[PDB]
């Protein structure tokens, strides 16, 4: 899936929209390991 996303960005479809979706203020999937209370931590300023 990561390779498919990178191929999509290489073709230049919505890569800026994906970058916006990868911003720091994003919800975290339940299956990940995170402390209770901080649901919105995943995503980083490294995305740009």
């Amino acid at each position: 899936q990561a390779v498919l996303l990178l191929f999509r960005c290489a073709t230049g479809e919505a890569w800026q929209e994906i970058m916006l979706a990868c911003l720091p203020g994003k919800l975290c999937d339940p299956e990940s390991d995170y402390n209770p209370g901080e649901e919105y931590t995943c995503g980083s300023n490294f995305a740009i």
Partner: protein
Amino acid sequence: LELFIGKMHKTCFFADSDIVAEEDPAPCAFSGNGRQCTANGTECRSGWVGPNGGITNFDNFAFAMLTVFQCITMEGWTDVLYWMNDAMGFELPWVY
């Protein structure tokens, strides 16, 4: 035409009504392999028009040729790929 014929016609509907349950509808599973409705009071059946109002589909030679040309031009091919991923599984459409 041989593979994806008449498969973009099943969207999440409402219980015993002709109202689409999504603001941006996507196809359901043609044979229980793709995407299924998750909402408690929604079911999906046939009779849907299509993803882009019926323009983009593979259920005719003209439609298939037009969507193949559009995919070749790099514009909106991921939309068709994701609609295929909703209709059928994840393994066949990505090869095409």
